[PDB]
């Protein structure tokens with residue numbers, strides 16, 4: 216459905232500051248000016264890194280439409296595109312920024328309930344892509360966005376297809392043969408979950424990328440996170456099985472994490488966890504009106 | 517109820533900072549403000565209205581019960597009160613709308629506004645008021661100034677319950693928007709809200725013309741008593757003007773009910789050209805599906821519009 220993607224002229228928006236960057240490109244906080252209107256509306260703009268092996272414009276657009284069609288509460292939807300000399304992608308700007316940064320910032324101060332819920336939400340997002348026969352190919356903590364602390368969405372879907380390689384998040388078959396599948400995504404999902412539990416620790420730190428395929432073949436895997444019970448780590452371990460069909464399906468993951476969300480304290484052992492706050496209804500209603508109006512969580516009991 | 521307790525957020529002064537004044541009103545002064553959630557680095561833009569001291573005042577608990585009622589409203593076309601800070605000055609916190617009030621917008625865009633927009637705005641405002649009437653609530657101050665634009669396609673009534681909470685001295689009062697019974701005896705009812713709706717529709721059709729310009733506020737009851745009314749706008753057909761005329765009938769029960777208005781204005785929207793005459797109207801048309809989709813994603817994720825047959 217083309218109605219979903221809006222092509223924009225350069226004049227109708229401006230980049231005002233840099234938010235970050237990736238292997239893919241640079242991201243800017245931008246302002247959209249509706250023509251004939253006096254408002255400026257904040258957006259996030261990614262200007263694509265320039266185009267080694269440039270693809271036909273029609274191909275870019277077809278990929279954009281698919282990108283534009285994503286309709287789930289936990290997957291970011293591509294809103295607009297401006298293509299000139301350069302390709303620029305427009306999406307909603309999220310004040311909280313990315314999940315990897317958010318966990319680092321609140322490093323030991325995050326409650327077990329938030330963490331398990333995030334795992335559920337990402338899995339729900341991934342499940343949606345699988346239903347649609349779509350492979351993200353680059354799931355990572357940096358590519359999850361915080362709409363509100365209680366709501367997160369996967370971003371950057373389609374980009375990897377659109378254009379270094381993230382070896383440390385990759386499935387062994389993908390590293391070896393460039394094979395990408397939902398199951399490979401499952402592998403990345405496990406790594407992403409490992410990032411959350413360790414509060415944004417870098418995976419395989421101190422081990423170079425070239426060594427990584429070799430460590431994996433040996434049977435080495437990321438270590439059990441300090442807050443994680445065996446019940447959680449095992450799911451991660453399963454995600455990293457060599458035989459891909461052996462790895463869990465995204466649907467199963469939603470259930471396991473949801474069950475855990477019901478009794479977070481049993482699953483995650485975090486210092487001061489009792490002290491930590493999981494969001495009140497009054498607080499939740501305030502958050503929704505201000506930031507998160509859209510349709511969309513598991514609580515202890 | 518518990519549900520009520522949840523809807524209104526008690527705010528500390530530490531929680532928010534006022535940054536800029538968006539305007540001033542009889543009720544108070546309005547600022548674009550930033551909310552900082554505890555333990556967070558983000559600042560969230562919000563609208564804070566800081567209340568002018570009430571005509572003879574009420575206890576905070578009294579203030580609070582009324583605030584719970586305001587936080588209570590849950591309709592697409594009525595602004596809901598998100599939060600309150602009562603520590604010193606009374607401050608009301610609500611969602612910030614970039615487009616601003618509808619009255620300024622029509623004034624700004626008078627050359628560029630289509631029939632489809634105008635009729636739809638009437639449907640939406642009537643819908644919101646009908647919702648308040650169902651809740652057994654009287655706004656008491658309807659005016660174009662008190663309607664906010666979420667997006668050009670979507671509008672919301674604001675400032676509900678302020679009049680009652682604030683009061684007014686007998687000795688700033690929206691006389692020209694008021695029903696005669698309200699002016700003379702200070703009777704306020706849904707039927708009086710209906711009269712205001714008539715004036716608000718007038719404000720829109722004339723594109724922000726002041727009502728009764730050149731007539732003193734003091735003279736207003738008399739001119740009305742004589743059967744004087746606001747003139748028919750050039751754009752408006754007789755069928756529209758008559759509806760406005762019904763709204764200003766002296767007998768309250770004779771006046772239209774909001775549900776009736778919703779239906780009638782809704783019918784009109786289906787054939788917009790028939791009911792209003794605007795030069796270049798075919799150029800001025802509702803946003804296409806692509807623009808509509810974009811707009812909603814950026815600004816309007818909540819919750820229709822009636823389009824031509």
Ligand SMILES: CN1CCN(c2ccc(Nc3ncc4nc(Nc5ccccc5)n(C5CCCCC5)c4n3)cc2)CC1
Nearest residue numbers: 234235236242259260261304306307308309310311312313
């Ligand atoms: C020192 N900090 C740095 C982080 N920061 C911040 C960063 C991002 C946001 N919000 C936001 N919103 C939407 C985004 N969409 C993409 N990504 C993206 C991908 C494809 C198309 C459009 C955007 N991003 C990226 C996510 C990775 C890190 C850079 C911003 C986005 N980021 C709010 C605050 C505030 C200052």
Ligand SMILES: CN1CCN(c2ccc(Nc3ncc4nc(Nc5ccccc5)n(C5CCCCC5)c4n3)cc2)CC1
Nearest residue numbers: 538539540546563565608610611612613614615616617675
């Ligand atoms: C020279 N002008 C200055 C004004 N301006 C502007 C002002 C407000 C907004 N948006 C916005 N949003 C929420 C509002 N909530 C109340 N009012 C309000 C009342 C009670 C509780 C909370 C808000 N307002 C009033 C609407 C009438 C004029 C003063 C701002 C609001 N207005 C957008 C643009 C554009 C440039």
